[PDB]
Amino acid sequence: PLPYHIPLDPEGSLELSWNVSYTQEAIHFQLLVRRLKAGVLFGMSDRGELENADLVVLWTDGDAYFADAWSDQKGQIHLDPQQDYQLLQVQRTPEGLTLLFKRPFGTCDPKDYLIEDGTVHLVYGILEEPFRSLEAINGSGLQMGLQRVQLLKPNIPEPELPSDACTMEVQAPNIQIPSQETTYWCYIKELPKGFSRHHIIKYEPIVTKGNEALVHHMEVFQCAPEMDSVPHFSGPCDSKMKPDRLNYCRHVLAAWALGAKAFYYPEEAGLAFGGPGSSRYLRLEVHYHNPLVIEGRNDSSGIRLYYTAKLRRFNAGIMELGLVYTPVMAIPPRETAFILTGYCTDKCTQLALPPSGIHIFASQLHTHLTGRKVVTVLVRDGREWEIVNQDNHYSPHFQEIRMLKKVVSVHPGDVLITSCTYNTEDRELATVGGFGILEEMCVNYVHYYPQTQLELCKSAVDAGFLQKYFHLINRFNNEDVCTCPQASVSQQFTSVPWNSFNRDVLKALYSFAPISMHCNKSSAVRFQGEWNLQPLPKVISTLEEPTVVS
Amino acid sequence: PLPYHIPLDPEGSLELSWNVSYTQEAIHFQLLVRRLKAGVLFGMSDRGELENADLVVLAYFADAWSDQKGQIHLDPQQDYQLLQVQRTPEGLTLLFKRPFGTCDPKDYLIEDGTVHLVYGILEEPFRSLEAINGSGLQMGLQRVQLLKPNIPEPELPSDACTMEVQAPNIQIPSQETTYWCYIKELPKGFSRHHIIKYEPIVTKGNEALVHHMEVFQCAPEVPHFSGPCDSKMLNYCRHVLAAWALGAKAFYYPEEAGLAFGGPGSSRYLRLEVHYHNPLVIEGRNDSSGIRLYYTAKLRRFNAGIMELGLVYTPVMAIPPRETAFILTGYCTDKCTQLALPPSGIHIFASQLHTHLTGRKVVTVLVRDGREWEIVNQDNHYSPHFQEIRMLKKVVSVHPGDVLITSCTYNTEDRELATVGGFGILEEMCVNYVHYYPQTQLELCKSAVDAGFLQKYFHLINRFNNEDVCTCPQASVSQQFTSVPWNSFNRDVLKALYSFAPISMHCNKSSAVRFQGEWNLQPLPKVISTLEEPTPQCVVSIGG
Ligand SMILES: *[C@@H]1O[C@H](CO)[C@@H](O[C@@H]2O[C@H](CO)[C@@H](O[C@@H]3O[C@H](CO[C@H]4O[C@H](CO)[C@@H](O)[C@H](O)[C@@H]4O)[C@@H](O)[C@H](O)[C@@H]3O)[C@H](O)[C@H]2NC(C)=O)[C@H](O)[C@H]1NC(C)=O
Ligand SMILES: *[C@@H]1O[C@H](CO)[C@@H](O[C@@H]2O[C@H](CO)[C@@H](O[C@@H]3O[C@H](CO)[C@@H](O)[C@H](O)[C@@H]3O)[C@H](O)[C@H]2NC(C)=O)[C@H](O)[C@H]1NC(C)=O
Ligand SMILES: *[C@@H]1O[C@H](CO)[C@@H](O[C@@H]2O[C@H](CO)[C@@H](O[C@@H]3O[C@H](CO)[C@@H](O)[C@H](O)[C@@H]3O)[C@H](O)[C@H]2NC(C)=O)[C@H](O)[C@H]1NC(C)=O
Ligand SMILES: *[C@@H]1O[C@H](CO)[C@@H](O[C@@H]2O[C@H](CO)[C@@H](O)[C@H](O)[C@H]2NC(C)=O)[C@H](O)[C@H]1NC(C)=O
Ligand SMILES: *[C@@H]1O[C@H](CO)[C@@H](O)[C@H](O)[C@H]1NC(C)=O
Ligand SMILES: *[C@@H]1O[C@H](CO)[C@@H](O)[C@H](O)[C@H]1NC(C)=O
Ligand SMILES: [Cu+2]
């Protein structure tokens, strides 16, 4: 058939399957309607709203007619005089009525939606009641929903597993999530004794059948190699009942977030764990968000690993690009698009990268609720070379590990620039970087080869410069005010009255001020050098991108 | 018959005439080639450079475009549509059509305001487009308003009489640029009349030489003079009855108003200034050109007047160096309009935009209750070298309490220092001269940033780029824009200051007196919102 498919409506009366051609630069959609009552509409839109939508509609109104349509800002449906969607075939089968139609990635028509890399928001609706023309169609009698998907796939078959492949299950024991709002939970598991060295070539999530809903992030780590670690453990990650060490495992075997399905490795590489000289226990950290907050729902959740005995050609690593989690990075309220940027500097890459460089075959983008756009680009001496990963339509609810269509080569001395665009319009206060639900993140997880000791390449604004910012706006408020309060970064940001000047000066600060750079190893230690007050990477540059049927 | 016309090349071997259709949303070009050499190319570009241009080249006719280095390539799409190619006594004429805009974003977009036309004459026979070289290529630009309002010529009062102000059959000096003053006069007595029209008079063959023309009234407080305006034979007869520039057909006052000239307070004597642009330095060329006024004895209902909108002239308004686009905004506040405007309000039928050399874009919008309602005037392609009084397509009504927002976009890329507001050539202006009725006592409605807040700017950036936190002696030392270390932060904070800080408001008559009150530190008008931009709806061979 057509290789990709998803359900649209929960009832499954609507099924969408599609295929992509990058030579023709076009998508072929096939829509299956099993049960058609009244009429049905399908299309795509920016955030998945019915408003400002690029659509296709069918009516039963006659004795069955199909037309291209578009919707305005108020959600009213109008016919499309040109056609972006081109109807190809219509056939009636036992499964239902099938419609094959074709669209280019983009049109010279500016009105239409533009298909590109990253997330695409599909809109579907089932119009319950017969309505005629388009414009009669009302919110009433319309079942109106959205589905998120990646329209442009790498078009590669998922490799699958040799006769050697074995499964290892890393799960929490069956533990009680506190009645607190938010919990981040550490657990210590260990490998069988005398465990020879292996490559994890696959992993998939495991979530208890009542909790799919409660568990929104899971991660599996390795502590520093030099060390033989603490006894067996289940419980929260801040507590001091818990020891010393851990805290020392930032090394990353596995990562899962909402929307991410199973992941298969590229065949050039696998992820190495066990064997001599590289060590220990696995640390599982599970993030529980519990608006529910009722008697402890008992949960053993985790990740399943698929591993092969020994080596594929290269060892694959995972690198964290982005903003460090600190309050000093903040988004003012009532912002339509506000951009936070973080960096991997040439100094860090020069220090931590091999002469050959690394090859990025995958990326996963991560923000919190206010995240809208995420992009990572590659820059060489102030000239933008390549786009590592891009999602303009990105949603926090849909976060998946994507195989890059083109593997990207990163060399020492290159700068990796990561930017996230946020919308704070639903927030009355400044949103700050942090672990909390009301706080934000900008992160790009990169899956690359050959493995290096570089894991966190991240940056943040210099604290001192943020302080002079605060004092600058304070004094712009005039009065006189010789006052030097310290820290309370979250408490300073919440205390700032937000006006055009404060916002613009904050944005200016982010676009100007030097950065505290974090270059850290798998060992959860920095690369020696002085990484504070680094000159802000800047780009001298930018890269340029060029009737009704029946 | 095509209503609008301009010369392109100085030699005058190429002449362009055109027609506008707003239902069809298209321009009809007719190109006249008097002398046909190997080739001719014509088109349009942002500032008038050959690079990145939307073109047509020449019986074979082809649509072309130019790349970043200015090399010419064929256009697979075509915006221009060839209609007719015909041979006449005057030369070879080509009638062709182009839409205002295309769904192709690469192509030029025709809109309100100035359009830069590019022309060339190919000396050398070429077998391709890409073969075209600086060699054998005669290259030029012409600035014009492509979309004119469609105004029918009103009937005349029959009382209406014409007075013609022309050069006294004089000889243009051998110079590239000449400005020529001549003094003409009215009969004595002659009580007040309304000018309801004026149109250009240009001697045949001199079309390329005449760039702009202006008719002025001297100060009431005069001897006869014909010759250059720098000649140092005594006057400022500055103030303006009439203005004309290339491409303009006629200027019409609205049915409600006319411009008054007559017995006192009128001045007695009139001054005409004609601008000759003379590349090639032609010589012994005689010119009678000037402007003809249509005026009536019986006044219409209102007297027409001119109001100055914009930035006050102060150094406090500055543009940092090396900016591609930097925006300065002046304001006419709700308090000023509420006070000085009649209850009925005023109606704006015309506008003239004024900046100095670094000016690129200029826009004036009308805002009601903090919401942008209508665009008074817009030029994104505006140039200081072409500035004319333009009739608005739709007369715009400004009521009491409405806010007028005027913004200019500047390019400082060629400047090493901060450019400041001022009269000088190296300093800047943002001004919109508005022609309206009924005439009121409001003459200058203008604004500027509050000086104190600018002081807070200088001390804030000074204390920020100098490093430490929390120290409070604060001795004040440097107050002015020169000597300032411009980096992204300083620029952005200056922009923030301009976008935030309250303004010193000038509501003036007389230039020597303000209106009725305390105008310092007025709250900056702000727009919760803005308005929607209208959508651009989505090798030939002809027998001669
Ligand atoms: C065309 O317009 C002219 C200007 O209105 C009409 O008047 C003629 O103007 C010229 C120059 O102004 C007068 O020439 C006079 O005689 C000599 C010559 O001036 C200079 O000439 C040569 C170059 O031609 C130059 O190299 C010499 O050094 C001279 O300086 C001057 O000394 C006089 O002061 C004065 O300029 C003509 O006399 C004058 N014509 C008449 C009939 O008075 C001219 O008539 C117009 N022509 C037409 C056909 O309409
Ligand atoms: C949204 O639009 C729909 C239709 O445009 C409205 O829903 C309902 O529409 C049906 C059928 O058109 C109405 O039934 C009526 O039956 C009588 C028979 O006596 C017939 O003469 C009428 O012409 C009509 O067909 C039904 O009354 C109507 N529901 C209502 C009025 O509550 C719906 O009301 C619209 N809602 C909004 C918020 O616009
Ligand atoms: C509108 O009219 C007012 C008149 O009230 C103009 O105000 C200006 O007020 C200053 C007084 O501060 C005067 O100009 C300057 O005076 C200072 C001394 O204070 C002197 O050092 C300067 O050299 C300058 O002369 C004057 O009263 C007046 N200036 C002008 C040019 O009229 C205001 O400027 C007017 N606004 C316009 C015409 O846009
Ligand atoms: C990278 O560098 C070190 C390695 O862990 C971390 O520095 C510690 O950070 C914690 C929390 O901010 C402090 O309590 C410690 O005092 C720091 N140690 C030292 C020696 O400064 C740093 O946080 C790491 N950054 C990451 C992992 O993003
Ligand atoms: C997409 O599907 C069409 C018919 O459904 C087929 O002809 C075409 O080859 C397919 N393209 C692919 C699989 O790339
Ligand atoms: C302009 O286009 C052609 C000129 O030949 C003519 O048919 C048309 O009527 C003209 N329309 C206007 C409004 O000038
Ligand atoms: Cu997170």
Numbering used by the authors:
A (entry chain A): 46 to 108, 110 to 592, 608 to 611
B (entry chain B): 46 to 103, 110 to 272, 276 to 287, 292 to 596, 609 to 614
Copy out sentences from the published article reporting this entry, exactly as the authors wrote them.
Dopamine β-hydroxylase (EC 1.14.17.1, dopamine β-monooxygenase) (DBH) catalyzes the hydroxylation of dopamine to norepinephrine and is thus vital for regulation of these neurotransmitters. DBH is an ascorbate-dependent glycoprotein that requires two type 2 bound copper ions per subunit to be active. Each chain folds into four domains: the DOMON domain, the catalytic CuH and CuM domains, and the C-terminal dimerization domain. The DOMON domain has an immunoglobulin (Ig)–like β-sandwich structure, the catalytic core (the CuH and CuM domains) has the same topology as the structure of PHM, and the dimerization domains consisting of two antiparallel α helices form a four-helix bundle.
Here, we report the first crystal structure of DBH: the structure of full-length dimeric human DBH. In the A chain, the two catalytic CuH and CuM domains are in a closed conformation, and in the B chain, they adopt the same open conformation as seen in PHM. The conformation in chain B is similar to what was observed in the structure of PHM, with a Cu-Cu distance of approximately 14 Å. However, as seen in Fig. 2C, in chain A the two copper ions are close together—approximately 4 to 5 Å in what appears to be a closed active site with a coupled binuclear copper site, as elaborated on below. Three of the four copper sites are not occupied, but the CuM site in chain A is weakly occupied, and a copper has been modeled. Furthermore, the pH in the crystallization condition is approximately 4.2, well below the pKa of the coordinating histidine residues, which therefore will be protonated and not able to coordinate copper. However, we observe that the helices are definitely linked by C528A-C530B and C530A-C528B disulfide bonds. The asymmetry is also reflected in the dimerization domain, where an extra α helix is seen in the A chain. Behind the possible ligand-binding pocket appears to be a metal ion–binding site coordinated by Asp99 OD1, Leu100 O, Ala115 O, and Asp130 OD1/OD2, with Asp114 and Asp126 quite close. On the basis of the presented structure of human DBH, a possible mode of action is that the closed form represents the catalytically active form, and that the open form is catalytically inactive but allows for loading of substrate, release of product, and recycling of the copper redox states.
